[PDB]
Design a protein around this ligand. Structure first.
Ligand SMILES: Nc1nc2c(ncn2[C@@H]2O[C@H](COP(=O)(O)OP(=O)(O)O)[C@@H](O)[C@H]2O)c(=O)[nH]1
Ligand SMILES: [Cl-]
Length: 171
């Protein structure tokens, strides 16, 4: 009945937080999921949140780089971090914002999926290089994976979520 994405997580409640710098490709990704309408709410002044929710699946999105964050963090099961692989000037900023997330105690048990997006672009930073620059090899007791993606084509998004689904299958 729903999209291919609607079945990727089975029936159990799935709470995903997907963040990144502005223009990383997050809205594009939500739209490819085909899990229904992208709805924007402003639960506190200056804090725009996008949500796609389909039955047992809830994706919450905002830009990075607040007291309200904690309630999301506390039961977030998957953390998706989206990076514009072609924006070399902002990779350090992206990396710092990811590290800040990973340092939040309330996100301690989140499985981390990194979407290395805009891999279609000629000057995109290779996944190996990006993985190094985001500092992921220094992480201890975090389950993580970096997925090459082209959100505008859709490429990689199911691959990444399939991985995340397997990692969280016993949630
Ligand atoms: N070349 C390329 N452009 C992309 C890709 N993903 C998203 N974009 C473009 O990047 C811009 C920002 O995307 P958007 O989804 O609004 O980013 P957001 O600010 O993170 O929500 C738009 O012009 C998208 O079409 C991609 O994989 N490749
Ligand atoms: Cl689909």
């Amino acid at each position: 009945r729903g999209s291919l994405f609607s079945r990727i997580f089975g029936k159990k409640q799935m709470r995903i937080l997907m963040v990144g710098l502005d223009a990383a490709g997050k809205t594009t990704i939500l739209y490819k999921l085909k899990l229904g309408e992208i709805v924007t709410t402003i639960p506190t002044i200056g804090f725009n949140v996008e949500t796609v929710e389909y039955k047992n699946i809830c994706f919450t999105v905002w830009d990075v780089g607040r007291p309200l964050w904690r309630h999301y963090f506390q039961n977030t099961q998957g953390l998706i971090f989206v990076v514009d692989s072609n924006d070399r000037e902002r990779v350090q900023e992206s990396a710092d914002e990811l590290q800040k997330m990973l340092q939040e105690d309330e996100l301690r048990d989140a499985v981390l999926l990194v979407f290395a997006n805009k891999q279609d672009m000629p000057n995109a930073m290779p996944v190996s290089e990006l993985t190094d620059k985001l500092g992921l090899q220094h992480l201890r007791s975090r389950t993580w994976y970096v997925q090459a993606t082209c959100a505008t084509q859709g490429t990689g998004l199911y691959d990444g979520l399939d991985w995340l689904s397997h990692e969280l299958s016993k949630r």
